Amino acid sequence: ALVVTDPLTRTECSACHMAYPAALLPARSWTALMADLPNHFGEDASLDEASRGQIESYLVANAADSSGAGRALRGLVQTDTPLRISELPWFKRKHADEVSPRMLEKARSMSNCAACHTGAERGLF
Ligand code: HEC
Ligand code: HEC
Q1: What positions does the entry give for heme c 2 binding (predicted)?
Q2: Cα 17 to middle of ligand 1, angstroms
Q3: Cα separation of 122 and 3, whole Å?
Q4: CB contact at 8 A, 64 and 72
């Protein structure tokens, strides 16, 4: 399932986009994100340390490499620490010949999964 099940992560990490599922980035990528929320893609996404710590635990514990080779890892080398799901080789492979300039214009960003996937919040893509 490609769904955030953790309530605090669901709340805090849906404030500005969809709460992205842990399974889509390796643990190192989640750590790096969670270590710099004051400088988060142009926004201040900083949290109180207690909330920050718990969210980091959940993301790392259910990351793409938390149960061996999740699909999202395909085409990654161990020295890659991607900070965007939308920059993964696996993501670009699934989207390349599928998204037209018009579909992309309407979504406004490949970060906006629900603009194209009605079931994105229930894990259906
Ligand atoms: C607003 C104050 C935000 C909060 C709270 C969180 N995030 Fe965020 N995030 C924000 C912006 C403006 C962007 C750029 C979107 C774009 O169109 O380029 C992002 C992006 C991400 C990503 C990358 C998405 C992708 O393209 O692959 C990830 C993985 C991500 N954000 C994670 C994340 C988490 C774990 C959060 C909770 C702690 C969280 N975000 C909150 C703005 C904001
Ligand atoms: C429109 C501009 C899109 C945005 C934004 C995102 N996705 Fe997407 N995605 C889009 C299309 C047209 C398709 C192909 C559908 C098909 O059946 O060919 C996809 C595909 C996926 C998939 C693969 C689904 C499967 O066949 O198993 C996944 C896992 C997926 N998309 C995830 C995903 C996420 C996490 C996004 C936000 C970060 C996202 N997509 C954005 C169109 C669009």
Answers
A1: 71, 95, 113, 116-117
A2: 6
A3: 6
A4: yes
